[PDB]
Amino acid sequence: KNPKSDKFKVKRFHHIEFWCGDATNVARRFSWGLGMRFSAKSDLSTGNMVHASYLLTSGDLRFLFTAPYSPSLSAGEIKPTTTASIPSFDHGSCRSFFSSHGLGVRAVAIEVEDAESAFSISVANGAIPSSPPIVLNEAVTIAEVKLYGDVVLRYVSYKAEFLPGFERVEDASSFPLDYGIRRLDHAVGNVPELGPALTYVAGFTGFHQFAEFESGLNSAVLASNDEMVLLPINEPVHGTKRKSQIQTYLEHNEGAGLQHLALMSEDIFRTLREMRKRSSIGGFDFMPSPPPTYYQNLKKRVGDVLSDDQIKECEELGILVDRDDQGTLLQIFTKPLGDRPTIFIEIIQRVGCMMYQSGGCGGFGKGNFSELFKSIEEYEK
Amino acid sequence: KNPKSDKFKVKRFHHIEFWCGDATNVARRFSWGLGMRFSAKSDLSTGNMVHASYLLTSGDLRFLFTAPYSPSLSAGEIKPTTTASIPSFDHGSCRSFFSSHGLGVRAVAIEVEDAESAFSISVANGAIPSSPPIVLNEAVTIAEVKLYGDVVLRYVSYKAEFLPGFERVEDASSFPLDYGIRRLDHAVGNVPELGPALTYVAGFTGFHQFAEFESGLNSAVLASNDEMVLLPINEPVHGTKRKSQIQTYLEHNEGAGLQHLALMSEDIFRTLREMRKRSSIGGFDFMPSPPPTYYQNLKKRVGDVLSDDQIKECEELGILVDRDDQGTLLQIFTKPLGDRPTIFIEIIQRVGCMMYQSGGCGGFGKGNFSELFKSIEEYEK
Ligand SMILES: O=C(O)C(=O)Cc1ccccc1
Ligand SMILES: O=C(O)C(=O)Cc1ccccc1
Ligand SMILES: [Co+2]
Ligand SMILES: [Co+2]
C-alpha cells in the first residue's frame, strides 16, 4: 500500500555532498576506488574564494566533495557579493561539521519541480529550515531543510551543467573511469530514536512507509510517490549480546548522521571485480565474506534466479543475496570510507519488478541477518 | 666551506608527518600516487582512542598521516594515561592547524643520537619548545621544537618498528607498490623574512649555510655536518611584475609553513613514468613542461652527462636539468597536493659527487630560473 501522499513533486536523487577537510584528496581517492569521473569543479580557478568543490559522476550518480578555504580569502565579501557557488555554504558550519563528525555526508539532494515551493511546504509542515531558497543565475533554485543530525535534505529545481558557477573539467584531467555504477538507490540514516525521526521527516515530506517483506537495530523506510527516493532510518537496540553497531556509529559520529549510501550497479559482478582489484592500491575495502555454507544455502533460496555459475561468482566476490516476494537483491558492503567507523557504501543490483524497474525491488536485505547467523553454524561443519 | 658546527649529533631525515582531517583518504591517495606501501598503523584497532595515524614507506622515505578522533573517545584520559602513540599530539592543536593551513606538514622529523640532549641543547640555544622529551616504552625518545610557522622540528632517538604502539600492517592490506622513490632529500620552508628565520634555526641547531653555485624569492639552505639533512628556506621578493609565488603561499597558508618535499628517486625516469600514468586516476599532477627549446638547449649544457636518448627521455617526462660544479640535478615539480596552492612535491635524482654520494650534489636548481626564461623566447621560433 502506497498512499502517494508527497506534499510536493519529487523527481529523483540528484547528488550527495560530502563535507571534507581537503576535497582534492577525498575526491581523487573516491574517483579511483569507485570508478567515477571528474566532471565539474568550483574552486579558486573558477573564481570561488570561499570553498573548493569537485563533482564526480558515474552514470546518474553525482558525488560532490567540498572543503573550505581560509576565511581570509573572502573576508571582504558579504552574502550579496559572495563568490561561493553554493550559497548555503558557511565556513564555520563546515569546520564544525567536520570537527564533530569527521568525513561524512552533509547534504542528500533530491530534484524537485520547484525548490521554493518544496521549501515552503516543508517548513509549513514542520521542517526545520537550514538554508532558504536561493535562485542561482536565474536558472537553478536551491533550498535546504534539516533531515537528521547535521545532515540536510537539499531541494534542487531547474527551469530548463551541474550548478551555475561550476565548470566542466578539462577532459585531459577527466579520465573516463567506469566500474558499472549508475545511480543512488537509497541513503540510510542512523538516529537515537526511530519513532520521532520518522514522524518528523514523513511529517514535512509526505513520504510514506515502504512495505517490507532480533539483533542490533530497528529500521523503517520512507519513500516518495513512485518510490524512487528511498530513505531508510535505523535506531539502536540496547542490551544485546553484541553491542549495537548503530550505537557504535552514534558514539563515533557524535550523534545522528548518514550511515551509508547504496549505489546501484548495472553489473554488480563487474563493479565488485574492479573495486576489489583496487582495494589495496588506494580504493575501498570490503566487509569479510560470508562463509561458504551461506553460498551452499543459496541454491535452495535463489536457484531459480541465479545459475550455479552466477552463484559461484557471487561466492568469489563475497556478494550477499536476499529476496522478497517481488524481486531479488544482490548486495555487498564496504568497510568505513574514512578514519571513523561511521559512513560506508553498499553496492547493489536488483532483479525483477519490471514493467522499467519499480523502486525497492527485492527490499533492503531484511532476510540477510538470519541467513547469516544460520550459516555461521559452519563452525561445526 | 662547511664548519661542521652541529651542536648535537644528527643522523638522517626520519619521517614527515602530515596533519589531516581524514588520514585514511589522504594516505590511500598518496600511496597510489607516489608508490608507497602501507607499513604501520596506530588507530582504534591498535587501542589508540586519540588519533588515527598511518605510515607509508618507500625505501627509507617515511610519510605519516595523522588525524584526530572525536575528543569524546578519550575524554576520561589524562596525559599519564593516554592511549595516543604520539604523546605530542593534541586535538585542539591539530584541528587549529588544519583549519588554519589545510592539509600540510606538521613535523619534519630527524633521527639524532639522543633526543633529550638535542632538545635541551636546542632550547638552551634559542629553540622555542613545542613538546618536551618523552620516552616511549623505554625504547624511543621523541621531542619537538618550533621550526617555522606551525611546523615543528621533531627529534627521534632509538636505544637500539616505527614507534612503540604502532603495528605493522597485515600484508593482505599492504600492496608492495614502488615507483622508485627512496629517501627525503630536502624539505623547503616559506617564511615572510628569510634573515630572522635563518638566524633562529641556525642558532639552535648549529646547521651551516650550504654553498650554492631576479624574480620572486630569495633563499638559503641550512645543512647538518655531513650535509645529509638539508633545509632550504624561501622568502618573497615584493614589487615584481609577476606576483611572488612565495607571497601567494603565505596568503593561502595563513603564514609560514613547509612549501615542498624533495624526494630522491633511484630512477627518476621510472618514477615519473609511473606517477604520470596515474595523474588522472587518483595520483598527482605535474607542473607544465618546459618548451622544446629548453631541451634543445640541454645538449650544450649537459650533453657530457646525458645521451641524446636520455635527453629525449627528459623531454618526454618534462624533467628539468641543472648543474653546478660538482654534479647534475634532474628534477620535476608536482602541482599542489591538496585544495590550496601551498604544499607540493619535487622528485629529484642527483648525478656525481661520488666517493657514496655527498649531500646536495648538483645544488637545488638555482640555474633553472634563468634557463627557463631564456627558453620562453621560443615565442618567436
Ligand atoms: O535500514 C536499512 O534498510 C538497512 O539495511 C540499514 C543497515 C544495514 C546494515 C547494517 C546496519 C544498518
Ligand atoms: O630554496 C630552494 O632551494 C628552492 O628551490 C625553493 C623553491 C623552488 C621552486 C619554487 C619556489 C621555491
Ligand atoms: Co541498505
Ligand atoms: Co627544491
Q: What is the DSSP letter of B186?
A: E
Q: What whole-number distance in Å separates Cα of residue B221 and Cα of residue A144? A: 52
| Terminal Cα-to-Cα distance of chain B (whole angstroms) | 43
**Domain termination residue (choose one: A143, A160, A178):** A178
Check CB contact of A81 with chain B, cutoff 8 Å.
no
- State residue B351 phi and psi, 5-degree precision: -125, 120
Q: What whole-number distance in Å separates Cα of residue B215 and Cα of residue A11? A: 56
Between positions 166 and 185 of B, the ones with CB within 8 A of A are 172-175, 177
Say whether both B282 and B260 belong to one domain.
yes
Say whether both A119 and A218 belong to one domain.
no
Cell (9 digits) for B354: 661520488
- Domain containing A251: what range? 179-381
Say whether both A259 and A365 belong to one domain.
yes
Element (H, E) at B98: helix B91-101
Which residues on adjacent β-strands are paired with residue B143? B155
Say whether both B186 and B140 belong to one domain.
no
* CA proximity to A87, closest of A136, A45, A24, A151: A136
* CA proximity to A113, closest of A85, A137, A84, A143: A143
**Domain termination residue (choose one: B178, B205, B222):** B178
Residues B111, B349: contact at Cβ < 8 Å? Answer: no
Residues A318, A289: contact at Cβ < 8 Å? Answer: yes
Amino acid letter, residue B118: A
| Terminal Cα-to-Cα distance of chain A (whole angstroms) | 43
Cell (9 digits) for B315: 623531454
Residues B35, B270: contact at Cβ < 8 Å? Answer: no
> B251: burial class by Cβ within 10 Å (0-12, 13-18, 19+)?
middle
* CA proximity to A118, closest of A6, A199, A3, A15: A6
Cell (9 digits) for B352: 656525481
Measured from the Cα of A245, ligand 1's closest atom is: 11
Residues A330, A286: contact at Cβ < 8 Å? Answer: no
Cell (9 digits) for A222: 520512507
Say whether both A268 and A370 belong to one domain.
yes
B236 lines ligand 2 (CB under 6 A): no
Cell (9 digits) for B172: 593482505
CA distances (Å), origin B302, targets A281, B310, B311, B367:
37, 11, 9, 13
What is the resolution in angstroms? 1.7
The residue written with cell numbers 595563513 in the block is B254
A88 lines ligand 1 (CB under 6 A): no
Q: What whole-number distance in Å separates Cα of residue B202 and Cα of residue B194? A: 12
The answer to whether A72 contacts B281, with C-beta atoms less than 8 Å apart, is no
Written in H, E and C, the secondary structure of chain A is: CCCCCCCCCEEEEEEEEEECCCHHHHHHHHHHHHCCEEEEEECHHHCCCCEEEEEEEECCEEEEEEEECCHHHHCCCCHHHCCCCCCCCCHHHHHHHHHHHCCEEEEEEEEECCHHHHHHHHHHCCCCEEEEEEEECCCEEEEEEEEECCEEEEEEEECCCCCCCCEECCCCCCCCCCCCEEEEEEEEEECCCHHHHHHHHHHHHCCEECCCCCCCEEEEEEECCCCCCEEEEEEECCCCCCCCHHHHHHHHHCCCEEEEEEEEECCHHHHHHHHHHCCCCCCCCECCCCCHHHHHCHHHHHCCCCCHHHHHHHHHHCCEEEECCCEEEEEEEECCCCCCCCCEEEEEEEEECECCECCCCCCCCCCHHHHHHCCHHHHCC
Q: What is the DSSP letter of B113?
A: S
Q: Which residues contact A298 (CB under 8 A, 6 or more apart)?
A: A306, A311, A314, A321
* CA proximity to A270, closest of A226, A330, A220: A330
The answer to whether B281 contacts A70, with C-beta atoms less than 8 Å apart, is no
Beta strands in B30-116 (DSSP E): 37-42, 51-58, 61-68, 104-112
A232 lines ligand 1 (CB under 6 A): yes
Cell (9 digits) for B353: 659527487
Say whether both B170 and B191 belong to one domain.
no
* CA proximity to B306, closest of B289, B326, B321, B324: B321
The answer to whether A24 contacts B70, with C-beta atoms less than 8 Å apart, is no
Chain breaks in chain A (C to N over 2.5 A) after: 160, 213, 355
Say whether both B24 and B142 belong to one domain.
yes
Q: Which residues of chain B does A98 touch, with a Cβ-Cβ cutoff of 8 Å?
A: 21
Residues A64, A15: contact at Cβ < 8 Å? Answer: yes
Check CB contact of A89 with chain B, cutoff 8 Å.
no
Residues B205, B148: contact at Cβ < 8 Å? Answer: no
Q: What whole-number distance in Å separates Cα of residue A172 and Cα of residue A282? A: 21
Say whether both A309 and A227 belong to one domain.
yes
Say whether both A203 and A129 belong to one domain.
no
Q: Which residues contact B172 (CB under 8 A, 6 or more apart)?
A: A280
Which residues on adjacent β-strands are paired with residue B53? B42, B66
CA distances (Å), origin A289, targets A235, A248, A285, A307:
25, 21, 11, 20
Q: What whole-number distance in Å separates Cα of residue A39 and Cα of residue B210? A: 46
Number of structural domains found in chain B: 2
CA distances (Å), origin B222, targets A309, B145, B169:
65, 16, 36
* CA proximity to A145, closest of A156, A134, A135, A132: A132
* CA proximity to A15, closest of A68, A55, A67, A73: A55
Residues B264, B60: contact at Cβ < 8 Å? Answer: no
Cell (9 digits) for A60: 546518474
Q: Using DSSP, state whether B141 is helix, strand or coil.
A: strand
> B288: burial class by Cβ within 10 Å (0-12, 13-18, 19+)?
exposed
Q: What whole-number distance in Å separates Cα of residue B26 and Cα of residue A209? A: 39
Which residues on adjacent β-strands are paired with residue A146? A152
A198 lines ligand 1 (CB under 6 A): no
Cell (9 digits) for A115: 525548490
Q: What whole-number distance in Å separates Cα of residue B341 and Cα of residue A135? A: 31
Q: Using DSSP, state whether B257 is helix, strand or coil.
A: strand
Q: Which residues contact B285 (CB under 8 A, 6 or more apart)?
A: A173, B279, B334, B335
Residues B225, B73: contact at Cβ < 8 Å? Answer: no
B219 lines ligand 2 (CB under 6 A): yes
Residues A114, A157: contact at Cβ < 8 Å? Answer: yes
Say whether both A167 and A183 belong to one domain.
no
Q: Using DSSP, state whether B271 is helix, strand or coil.
A: helix
Say whether both B287 and B156 belong to one domain.
no
Residues A129, A119: contact at Cβ < 8 Å? Answer: yes
In this structure, how many other beta carbons lie within 10 angstroms of the beta carbon of residue A281?
17
Q: Which residues contact A195 (CB under 8 A, 6 or more apart)?
A: none
Say whether both A170 and A196 belong to one domain.
no
Residues A141, A133: contact at Cβ < 8 Å? Answer: yes
**Domain termination residue (choose one: B133, B155, B178):** B178
Radius of gyration of chain B (CA): 21
Check CB contact of A337 with chain B, cutoff 8 Å.
yes
Which of A48, A276, A277, A280 to probe the B interface (max B CBs under 10 A)?
A280
The answer to whether B339 contacts A282, with C-beta atoms less than 8 Å apart, is no
Strands lying side by side in the sheet with A257-265 = A208-209, A217-223, A230-236, A181-190, A257-265, A344-352, A327-333, A320-323
Q: What whole-number distance in Å separates Cα of residue B65 and Cα of residue B61? A: 13
Which residues on adjacent β-strands are paired with residue B13? B110
Q: What whole-number distance in Å separates Cα of residue B361 and Cα of residue B349? A: 9
* CA proximity to B36, closest of B179, B186, B185, B162: B179
Cell (9 digits) for A381: 561443519
* CA proximity to B166, closest of B46, B60, B58, B62: B46
Q: What whole-number distance in Å separates Cα of residue B371 and Cα of residue B381? A: 16
Measured from the Cα of A232, ligand 1's closest atom is: 1
Q: Using DSSP, state whether B99 is helix, strand or coil.
A: helix
Residues A332, A344: contact at Cβ < 8 Å? Answer: no
Beta strands A344-352; A327-333: pairing state: antiparallel
